[PDB]
Write a protein that binds this ligand. Structure first.
Ligand code: RET
Length: 137
């Protein structure tokens, strides 16, 4: 597999519903949904070490991890968490998250490379799955 690339979003589903679960009020939900239409992902993969840069028009953030080794990032709504990524198959990985402080919904994410050259990202909070699809730039 090689997730490496510059990915641009073509589709985003259930993002507002995910943010609702996470407690975001309606006006900021709509504003966040609009910002997601400029969501871009840059990935550099070497073996099972990943460097990922998530960006929108006004914000950018870097996630660095190795499969099977705990690291710290933040949940979608911004709370700090501890994460662990594992492979599910040749071209799909899953991340489980645990809040560093307090309680909240159970969150996770996945990344998948399809046979058609798309990148599929999902983000989950409890019952609600947001799916976002990307192509290479
Ligand atoms: C492997 C990919 C990961 C861990 C992606 C993480 C992406 C996010 C936490 C995205 C968050 C967003 C918002 C909270 C509002 C603006 C739109 C997004 C999708 C960039």
């Amino acid at each position: 597999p090689n997730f490496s690339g510059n990915w641009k979003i073509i589709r985003s589903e259930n993002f507002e519903e995910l943010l609702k679960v996470l407690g975001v009020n309606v006006m900021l939900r709509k504003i966040a949904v609009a910002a997601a239409s400029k969501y871009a992902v840059e990935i550099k993969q070497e073996g099972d070490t990943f460097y990922i840069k998530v960006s929108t028009t006004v914000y950018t953030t870097e996630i660095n991890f190795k499969v099977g080794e705990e690291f710290e990032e933040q949940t979608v709504d911004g709370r700090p968490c501890k994460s662990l990524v594992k492979w599910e198959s040749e071209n799909k990985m899953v991340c489980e998250q645990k809040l560093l402080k307090g309680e909240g919904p159970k969150t996770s994410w996945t990344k998948e490379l399809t046979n058609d050259g798309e990148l599929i990202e999902t983000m989950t909070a409890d019952d609600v799955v947001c799916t976002q699809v990307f192509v290479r730039e």
